[PDB]
Amino acid sequence: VSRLVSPRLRIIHRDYLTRRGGRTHQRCSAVAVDYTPTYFATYKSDPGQCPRLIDAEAVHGDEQAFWSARRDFYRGGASRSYYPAWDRQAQALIMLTREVPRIPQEAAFRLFTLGLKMMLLPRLVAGV
């Protein structure tokens, strides 16, 4: 059983001996689920032709202005700290999960699949 049953997702583990405490040599672990090296070809293309990955410019233009954005108003002043990352995703996660318009054009065949049973039953019936 694949752990993350999504076969493209591959869990990679890396334990390191880094200097913590200035002198010590502790054990730090960098665990991560990343895409299988299978899914690396169509991503080292800049258009992100590999799906599941969207050029951030798509969901909104100029992250150079959307992440570099700083609090501005009467509540911001000149101590205009950057935005907290916890919503700065939300204003981008909410933009990812918007309504995309399922058009009735696809719904026709799906409707042509809606009346699938009711009308294919008498087809074999009336065809003897």
Binding site: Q64, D72, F73, Y74, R75, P84, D87, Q91, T97, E99
Partner: protein, 326 residues
């Protein structure tokens, strides 16, 4: 005789004619996300910008023939301008030596000495000089404040009535005693009794509020989504709760949930009461049922119009109606 416009405060911004070419020159050529090296500031006349020590020198410290910039300046500042209007130039030099400069309206100290007709040295703060200098009246500061906008992309905000207290204070700090304040009597009028003058202010001064609030609320609705989030007030907490509430954050959590205006996600009785069972062990607020908290634990920075729009139970009926749609 002829009052130009009788409206309770509609003369807020300039004339659209002068406000048309107001921002044609007072515009910010957008920051190229480069690393600035020098943020210089000058006073320069209308179009009398020279290659001398005031400008050409600081370029020549860096080897730039500022004989060009002065022309690129005068490519934008020679027309449009009454003679001898000393502007401020905000030259900004990047690590590629490519400058970018915003021309700006004259310093309000320059405005103030004009509007009172006093030269250099005549004006001063009373504690250095002993006398109030030339008078003014609030009616005048409101027009020094109209050519002084922080964002010359957004001329509207901060509002006028909120940035005139700025130019007023800068005036008083120069000795400019304006009449509406600082004195026993306001500007005397041949129109009516002082009472018939004060009774016509008590209506105007409050009509402005529903004008000023709406403009403060309409700006709120456009503010970043985080600015409309909930930030509970800290005036109720007494400074031992306010300190015993900083050692353990749990109290400032359960507080937030305890006093949070009703939304679709906070209509969980157990969630809101889980907090209410945490505070009681801490001996915090115990005699204040949820309502009288929200009216005191509200973001005081909200405009009074929306200060209510979130107030339980005004947001209780339609509470469960508005949700993350899909």
């Amino acid at each position: 005789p002829k009052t130009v416009n009788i409206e309770p405060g509609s003369n807020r911004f300039l004339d659209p004619n002068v406000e048309a070419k107001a921002k044609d020159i007072f515009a910010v050529p957008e920051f190229p996300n480069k690393a600035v090296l020098h943020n210089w500031r000058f006073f320069i006349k209308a179009g009398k910008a020279a290659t001398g020590p005031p400008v050409g020198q600081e370029f020549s410290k860096l080897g730039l023939k500022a004989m060009d910039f002065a022309k690129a300046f005068n490519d934008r500042t020679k027309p449009h301008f009454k003679d001898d209007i000393e502007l401020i130039v905000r030259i900004q030099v990047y690590f590629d030596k490519s400058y970018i400069f915003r021309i700006e309206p004259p310093p309000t100290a320059w405005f103030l000495l004009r509007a009172i007709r006093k030269k250099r040295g005549e004006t001063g703060p009373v504690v250095l000089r002993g006398n109030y200098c030339a008078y003014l009246t609030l009616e005048m500061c409101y027009e020094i404040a109209k050519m002084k906008q922080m964002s010359w992309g957004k001329v509207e905000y901060p509002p006028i009535e909120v940035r005139v207290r700025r130019v007023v204070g800068q005036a008083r700090r120069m000795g400019i005693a304006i009449i509406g304040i600082d004195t026993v009597h306001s500007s005397p009028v041949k129109g009516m009794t002082e009472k018939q003058y004060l009774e016509e202010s008590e209506k105007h001064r409050k009509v402005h509020m529903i004008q000023y609030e709406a403009l403060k609320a309409k700006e709120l609705e456009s503010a970043p989504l985080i600015e409309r989030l909930h930030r509970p007030n800290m005036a109720p907490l007494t400074n031992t709760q306010l300190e015993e509430g900083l050692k353990d954050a749990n109290l400032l959590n359960a507080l937030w949930k305890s006093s949070h205006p009703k939304s679709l996600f906070t209509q969980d009785t157990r969630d809101r009461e889980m907090a209410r069972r945490y505070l009681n062990t801490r001996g915090w607020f115990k005699e204040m049922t949820p309502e009288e908290m929200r009216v005191v634990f509200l973001n005081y920075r909200l405009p009074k119009q929306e200060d209510h729009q979130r107030q339980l139970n005004m947001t209780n009926g339609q509470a469960q109606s508005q949700a993350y749609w899909s």
